[PDB]
Structures are given as structure tokens and as C-alpha cells.
């Protein structure tokens with residue numbers, strides 16, 4: 348089901364796959380081992396689906412936030428770098444791929460959203476979200492708009508929602524409290540309420556997705572977008588005079604992007620775990636490998652110490668780091684997917700006017716907390732009963 352003697356790799360359509368294939372070709376040339384790169388859709392859902400029955404890729408690339416849930420499902424192999432190699436990467440990056448004492452992936456890069464603006468339309472960019480509406484009024488009269496960014500994917504809206512108090516799970520004394528969810532606080536209400544208002548005041552469209560925001564920005568139709576470093580190269584092709592900067596503050600407080608570490612995990616069912624380790628350690632995570640991917644779509648602020656000191660001088664990276672320190676490193680816990688489904692439903696509903704901000708978040712709060720708990724209970728019931736019918740038929744029930 349996974350061919351012994353070859354490497355298949357999954358990484359998302361927005362990332363430097365053609366650049367990674369290049370690294371795959373170099374590997375193939377020293378070791379004779381063919382490396383194949385693919386980007387199926389809904390990768391982060393497609394992976395556990397197929398790997399759960401022993402198929403899928405030898406290697407899986409996603410942000411570190413999904414990996415806790417994969418490791419917990421027994422889907423990843425433990426990764427075991429020698430001290431000397433661990434040393435070449437930033438402590439905090441290893442930390443985000445650490446789950447229950449075990450490293451469960453290789454950290455590749457630090458990804459954070461920034462405000463991307465067109466210097467020709469908007470020479471000085473807004474420092475605040477509260478100035479965006481007025482700005483749009485003025486651009487509208489020129490057949491232009493202030494801002495478009497993907498509203499379909501809560502990853503994008505979230506730094507506004509967190510700005511005044513939203514959070515996934517509370518973090519104190521080294522552990523997460525999956526019973527303390529921060530999606531329906533007053534601050535998360537204010538944040539979404541502002542976003543929803545921009546829609547009501549027709550300063551944005553509820554349908555705006557990733558394609559639509561990217562085409563509009565890169566064609567000069569809109570003065571601002573919110574996007575991660577992978578988007579920079581398409582904008583370079585456009586020749587649009589752009590800057591990458593700090594996100595606008597809301598109610599006076601910085602916007603809080605969820606920070607992701609692009610990680611690479613080995614499929615626990617892979618019969619090429621040794622080849623997979625050599626490709627990631629001696630080929631990808633080098634000045635050579637990273638630069639090959641980064642040339643295709645920029646990775647952000649790479650894990651590897653030696654190559655980050657070059658990338659660090661770039662103002663678009665610094666903008667990334669400043670956005671990143673103002674935000675929070677995503678949790679990697681299994682209950683995270685529950686937080687994301689619930690918030691995806693909420694933003695979508697309040698934006699499309701299907702529910703108010705308040706009924707939207709009230710339901711997101713209930714649902715994230717219950718799905719979170721459900722994820723934990725389910726694990727334990729598997730520990731108590733493995734797969735006696737008592738096990739399957741208790742799970743069946745508990746989920747509804």
C-alpha cells in the first residue's frame with residue numbers, strides 16, 4: 348500500500364512543492380531513490396483518513412497544530428535526531444513538534460500572517476482596524492477597495508478575534524485546560540463583530556476566499572491583503588509595489604495571528620522511515636534544500652539556524668517575526684481540530700448573516716468544548732476497551 352523503496356510526499360498546494368520536488372531530485376541523484384511530491388486537496392483531513400488504514404505518504408507536511416491529533420491516533424513515527432542535529436534548529440521549533448515527551452515531526456519553518464499592502468495605492472498603511480472603513484470609502488470612489496483576505500478559513504480572521512481576548516484553550520503552568528475555551532468571550536465578540544460590520548457596511552464581501560483575495564490584490568484591485576509568506580512570490584510575478592508589515596491593532600491591542608510551524612512527519616506505516624529521515628535531515632533541512640523550496644514559495648522564518656540568519660535581514664521576514672511574537676504559537680493538542688471546525692462554522696455563519704455574532708460564538712463555545720472533551724473521552728474508551736463491540740458502540744453513542 349506504501350511502496351517499499353520510494354518516497355511519496357504530501358505538502359499543501361499553497362507551498363513550494365515544485366521547489367521541494369527539486370530537493371527530491373537531488374536526493375534521487377545521490378541515493379538512486381525516487382522521491383514523488385503531491386498536493387491533494389483537504390490534505391489535513393485526507394491524511395488521517397487514508398493513513399488510518401495504512402496507506403498515504405511516507406511524509407506529511409502541515410502546520411504543527413494537526414500533528415498532536417495524528418500522533419494520538421498512532422499515525423506518526425517518533426522522530427529521533429541526534430543532539431548535534433537538534434542543535435541546528437531553534438529550541439522553540441522542536442517544542443511545537445513535541446507531544447507527550449516525544450518529538451513527532453521535523454520543524455521546517457515559522458509561518459505567520461502579515462498585512463500585505465500596495466505602496467502605490469496606499470503609501471502609508473493603516474496602523475488600526477478602526478480606520479479601515481473610512482479608507483475603503485475613499486478608495487471606493489476610485490473603483491478600488493481597502494482590504495480583501497480569505498474569509499472562508501478561520502485561520503485568516505482569527506488574529507482580529509484574538510486581538511481583544513479570543514483564545515483556543517487557556518494555558519497556565521505548562522498545561523492546556525481543554526475546559527477553558529475562549530471563543531465566546533467579550534473580546535472574541537468585539538473582534539468578529541468588527542469583521543461582520545465591515546461586511547454590513549459593504550467594505551467586504553462574505554464570499555471572499557483565497558483565490559478572490561489573491562487575484563484582487565495582485566491585479567491592484569485592492570490596497571491590502573492578509574497572507575503568509577508563501578504568497579510573496581505570486582506577488583513578485585505581479586510586479587505590484589508591495590510592503591509586508593505589522594497587522595493593524597484592534598481596540599488598541601495588536602492582532603494575534605495563530606503562529607504555525609510547517610512540520611514534516613513520517614508515516615508510522617511507512618516502510619521507508621530510514622530514507623525519510625535522511626531526506627529530511629541531510630537534504631531538506633540544509634541551506635541548500637530550504638533555499639530550493641523557498642525560491643518556489645517562501646517558507647517564512649525557517650527552523651534552521653544557519654539559514655534563518657540570512658532570511659532575517661529581509662524586511663518581509665522581520666514583519667513575519669513581529670507578527671509572530673505579537674501572536675501565539677498554536678497548540679498541537681488533538682482537541683485543536685474541534686476548535687477549528689467550531690470557529691470555521693461560526694465565522695462563516697455570522698459573515699453570511701445565518702446567525703448573529705453572538706449566537707454564532709455561543710454555539711462555537713458549546714461545540715468546541717464538547718468536541719474537545721469528546722476527543723479525550725474517545726481516546727480513553729479505546730484504552731479501556733480497544734475494539735470489543737462495547738468499544739465501537741460506546742463511541743458511536745458519545746458522538747452526536
Ligand SMILES: OC[C@H]1O[C@H](O[C@H]2[C@H](O)[C@@H](O)[C@@H](O)O[C@@H]2CO)[C@H](O)[C@@H](O)[C@@H]1O
Nearest residue numbers: 359361410412413500501502503607687
Ligand atoms: O483555518 C483553519 C486552518 O488554519 C491553519 O491552516 C493554515 C496553515 O497552517 C497554513 O500553512 C496555510 O496553509 O493556511 C492554512 C489555512 O488556510 C491550521 O494549521 C489548520 O489546522 C486549520 O484547519
